[PDB]
Design a protein around this ligand. Sequence first.
Ligand SMILES: [Cl-]
Ligand SMILES: [Cl-]
Lengths: 68, 75, 67, 66, 67, 67
Amino acid sequence: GASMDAIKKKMQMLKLDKENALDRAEQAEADKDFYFGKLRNIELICQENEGENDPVLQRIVDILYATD
Amino acid sequence: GASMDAIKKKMQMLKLDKENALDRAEQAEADKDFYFGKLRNIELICQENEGENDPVLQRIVDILYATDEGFVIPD
Amino acid sequence: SMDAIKKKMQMLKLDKENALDRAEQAEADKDFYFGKLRNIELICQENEGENDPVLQRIVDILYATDE
Amino acid sequence: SMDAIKKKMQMLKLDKENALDRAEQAEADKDFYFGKLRNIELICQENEGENDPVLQRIVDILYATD
Amino acid sequence: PEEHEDILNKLLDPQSERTEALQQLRVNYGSFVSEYNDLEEKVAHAKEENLNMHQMLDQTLLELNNM
Amino acid sequence: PEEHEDILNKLLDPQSERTEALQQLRVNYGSFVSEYNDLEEKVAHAKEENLNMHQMLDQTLLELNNM
Ligand SMILES: [Cl-]
Ligand SMILES: [Cl-]
């Protein structure tokens, strides 16, 4: 009757909330990884070229290692 | 009952599962923003220097504008 | 090749447009179905006290989370 | 500049990706709800012999248009 | 009850009364079967309601496991 | 059924066996009320079980809403 139905409806809402939160987390992690992979690759490029003491690359290196 | 307690336990777990996922989302979005900030500054530096045709800067440009399929406009 | 780039940019725009069209249509179908489920829910809630086993099955379908 | 053309091409690809993601999710949500209506239809069909006026109202919802 | 025992007392020794008394017992046997049958239906109905409630709950707990 | 009527026929006309036959009716009636008794208390138990389960679910819903 009413109480069993209300319990089932509550459980469904909690489950849907959980799954929406997991979807949001997964998407945020993917976006983060997308940007992180770029910076890591740019870091590797700078490391290939560390010897040539290029002032433009030095600016880029300073950005890579700057902190919030 | 045990059966009524099992309902209460799982409801707590489902709320906790949600909270843990939201924590993950918020943290990942903050890192994403931190990273994106660096990438924008780097893009601007590359753009300033496009006229030089520096192969190392042009490689960085390709990394900047790549998607999961790889480089846009290959080679 | 500049021609190849123009062609590609046009294809990517059309592909995006087709997908947005798909999304809009699916969203409309989803709203239409959800509306029926809500009406069915209302009917079930009216008969809660009747303890009808068939309506109990329908309620279990309504609140199911298994896809 | 080629940098600007690459930047635009990236944006078109990512927008295409976003739109497809959105269509895929919309289709999933639609199928979820449709699957429920179909399960309810089967329950109604199984119980057609009862001549239940409540079930008949439900069937009228299932087969309604627009 | 108290009436049935008096009829068994009455029937112990001997024509109009003895046949009239057995017709009381012929009615009462079928009448006791009818009353038992009516009550058994009240039991079954109530057990069917109890089972419906448990089955609803059992299934809810199973679904809960997967969430 | 077949046990009963046959005894009701023996007693129609006249006899130490009739005392033995009436005792068979007395014991049967006994086993009738006692079987009905067992049934009345099955009903009371099913009613109890039903009521408590509704009470438990109603009370759990209240508790769930305070949590
Ligand atoms: Cl209930
Ligand atoms: Cl490309």
